[PDB]
Write a protein that binds this DNA or RNA. Structure first.
Lengths: 113, 93, 136, 74, 165, 47
RNA sequence: UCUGGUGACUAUAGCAAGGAGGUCACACCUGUUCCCAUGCCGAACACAGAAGUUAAGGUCUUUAGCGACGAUGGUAGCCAACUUACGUUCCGCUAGAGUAGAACGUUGCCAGGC
RNA sequence: GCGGUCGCCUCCUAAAAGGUAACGGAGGCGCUCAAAGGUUCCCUCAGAAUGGUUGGAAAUCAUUCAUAGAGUGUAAAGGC
């Protein structure tokens, strides 16, 4: 009955405080993930005028699946848009980013990096 | 109340205090169809606002064209003299 | 002696005395107001030597409503000494008035009393006054 | 689960005079009577309560001191 | 049992007691904040630490008075342990109906609260009574204050059969 | 608080100078510092 | 062109009421079997799954009552200037705050299922 | 003359850049801290009443009104 809290609120609110030092210049474009109720995302971004530089998606449906931490979570953890982009800065609003969204941070650590 | 004012002039130098002893007041209508296109009134025909409206109602304007009911709303009473300065109207639409 | 209780600082600056009035240019708590026409410092002692007296004309009749309260407390040195070794201890309370301000307010009682009462009261204040009839 | 607070405590078995109605979570240790599957197949020694013997709540009982009394020959 | 007794009677009423739009505007039970207190600043407070190991699930935090007027204020003593029901213990020593093990002051009031935060005080030795008075027969203060799933007393009332008071 | 002194045995020179309370921690303390003529953070004995 | 995602604007962008729809997509929804972990309770922090639903949020459309932006007409103040003794007054420039009439229930940046 | 002051830090006077006097009006310092330091996470203020051995209107954890009116080791302003 009493005030229940929304959580997209504080998710983007924290993205704010976290978006004060890290920002993709396309010379090192950050890739930055909207966790969802069932799925996960990612996208490379350049941050000079806010246009959308590069793009993939987990949910893009070359294959769908379940198990939000799947090898589908690590195929979104591999995919790229081939260019001259190198080992990006993993934007993380989600705790233990070194392991939580490591599903994304794992597979791409070799080719995009 | 049939009280008539006219379009006075802007770009005023403050030399008007002295043309003010001879009676006048500013006045500016609000409302659409026109704008803050000010009108000038005199007092000793307002020595008889006593019977005109009370304070809440109608006044004619005869201000060239668009002579309709206009409401003098605000108060700009003045100290030390029992004079008055810038009483002003509005359109009813 | 309308004075306060709790004050942060006890030594202050003389208030500015120039220009017109700001607020309290009308009357509320009664039909009749006594306006002011020049500038001075009314000094709480006037007020209670011009209140008891107006009521001693009013013979505990109708009721009054004061529109001036002394805030800035003025100070003064005791015996004439040298110049300059500190500031004198606070010994008064002052209120500043400008032209165009209602100082007193009363209701109910007849206009003969109003005139023949505020004329009694103004004879104590250092400011020149003028009657006001709630002249809408 | 984030451990590091409460110790060891789970459900138990207890049968009453009536209806045997006390089987919720427990932290109660004692010596087993005889175990079941309608209830614990483990040390059954939550003992016995007032849980269903009689409430005062939705019930009745005996009254207070007395009335006038000088109406039945005193 | 009790956690399901936060279901065994209530899912159908708490799906009907209101007639809201969807199932989820029609509430559940509001969470609890099992808190204890003391009336001594030293030893009763330093030695009223387990009765939570008895009733709550919290080992024992050390919060003190905040508002703390003239003689309330002290520091760091374990007078109020934050054993609020989160989800696991959110079926705590509260919905135990061991408030009948007194047979006094069951129906205390005509109502409960104008502030939705309800307070239900086992004042005396009403609660934790299945344990014999060994060391629990001394000074002991309670603080069962938590809100319920109803804006005022009104509909809170004539379906409150859970704790029946 | 009283003034102390640290020095790497290998170099045998006391250059670093820190402070320490005579009540908070009266027990002789020792930490690793970058003493000269070693090019490595050796152990310093706060004598 | 609808929604989801990033980057501009002075809350004109709001809190206060509601209205109505769907789960393509945000939501309410199942527990500790696991990754992490509340000195405190997996509600925040995590996992596999979603049979069940649209209240709420979410989005538009309504209230100018709730608050900021607040165009003119004046007026306080002020920079020169000629007077007089200034708690002023005249003469030239720039003219406020507050008060209204208003605008007022955001303009877009660039992508994804269409 | 007697008395009191004499170094460093903050504010007002000081007239919207900086600077600006009087035996003008107010407060402070002669440290402290192995943590109150560095780094990575994680969280959130007051003035508000609920009726809870006990109640000292104030002993408690909640809950919502909570707009910085809270908290900063130390005075005051500028900040968060």
């Amino acid at each position: 009955m009493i005030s229940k809290i929304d959580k997209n609120k504080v998710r983007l609110k924290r993205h704010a405080r976290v978006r004060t030092n890290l920002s993709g210049t396309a010379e090192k474009p950050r890739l930055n993930v909207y966790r969802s109720n069932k799925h996960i995302y990612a996208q490379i971004i350049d941050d000079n005028k806010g246009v959308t530089l590069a793009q993939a998606s987990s949910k893009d449906s070359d294959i769908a699946t379940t198990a939000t931490k799947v090898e589908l979570a690590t195929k979104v953890g591999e995919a790229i848009a081939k260019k001259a982009a190198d080992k990006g800065i993993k934007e993380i609003v989600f705790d233990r980013g070194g392991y939580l969204y490591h599903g994304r941070v794992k597979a791409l650590a070799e080719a995009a990096r | 109340s049939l009280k008539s004012i006219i379009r006075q002039g802007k770009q005023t130098r403050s030399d008007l205090k002295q043309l003010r002893k001879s009676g006048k007041v500013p006045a500016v209508v609000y409302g659409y169809g026109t704008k803050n296109v000010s009108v000038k009134v005199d007092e000793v025909e307002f020595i008889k606002v006593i019977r005109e409206v009370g304070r809440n109602g109608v006044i004619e304007l005869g201000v060239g064209s668009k002579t309709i009911k206009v409401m003098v709303a605000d108060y700009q009473f003045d100290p030390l003299k029992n004079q008055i300065t810038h009483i002003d109207f509005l359109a009813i639409n | 002696m309308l004075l306060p209780k709790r004050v942060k600082y006890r030594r202050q600056h003389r208030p500015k005395t120039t220009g017109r009035s700001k607020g309290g240019n009308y009357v509320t708590f009664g039909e009749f107001g006594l306006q002011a026409t020049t500038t001075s410092w009314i000094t709480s002692r006037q007020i209670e030597s011009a209140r008891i007296a107006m009521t001693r004309y009013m013979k505990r009749g109708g009721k009054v409503w004061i529109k001036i309260f002394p805030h800035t407390p003025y100070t003064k040195k005791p015996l004439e000494v040298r110049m300059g070794a500190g500031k004198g201890a606070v010994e008064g309370w002052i209120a500043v008035v400008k032209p165009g301000r209602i100082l007193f307010e009363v209701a109910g009682v007849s206009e003969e009393v109003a005139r023949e009462a505020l004329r009694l009261a103004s004879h104590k204040l250092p400011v020149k006054t003028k009657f006001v009839k709630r002249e809408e | 689960m984030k451990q590091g607070i409460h110790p060891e405590y789970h459900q138990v078995i207890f049968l009453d005079t009536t209806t045997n109605f006390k089987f919720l979570s427990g932290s109660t240790k004692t010596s087993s009577e005889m175990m079941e599957w309608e209830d614990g197949k483990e040390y059954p020694v939550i003992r016995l309560d007032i849980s269903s013997d009689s409430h005062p709540f939705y019930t009745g009982r005996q009254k207070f001191a007395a009335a006038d009394g000088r109406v039945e020959r005193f | 049992r009790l956690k399901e007794k936060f279901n065994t009677e209530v899912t159908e009423n708490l799906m009907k007691k209101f007639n809201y739009s969807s199932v989820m505007e029609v509430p559940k039970i509001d969470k609890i904040v099992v808190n204890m207190g003391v009336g001594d600043a030293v030893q009763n407070s330093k030695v009223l630490d387990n009765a939570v190991e008895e009733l709550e699930l919290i080992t024992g935090q050390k919060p003190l008075v905040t508002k703390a007027k003239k003689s309330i204020a002290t520091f760091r003593l374990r007078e109020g342990m934050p054993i609020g029901a989160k989800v696991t213990l959110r079926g705590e020593r509260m919905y135990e109906f061991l408030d009948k093990l007194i047979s006094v002051s069951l129906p205390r009031v005509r109502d409960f609260q104008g502030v939705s935060k309800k307070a239900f005080d086992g004042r005396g030795n009403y609660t934790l009574g299945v344990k014999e008075q060994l060391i629990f027969p001394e000074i002991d203060y309670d603080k069962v204050s938590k809100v319920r799933g109803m804006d005022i007393v009104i509909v809170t009332t004539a379906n409150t059969d859970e704790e029946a008071r | 608080r009283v003034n102390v002194t640290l020095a790497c045995t290998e170099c045998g020179d006391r250059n670093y100078i820190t402070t320490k309370n005579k009540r908070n921690n009266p027990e002789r303390i020792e930490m690793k510092k970058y003493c000269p003529r070693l090019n490595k953070y050796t152990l310093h004995r706060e004598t």
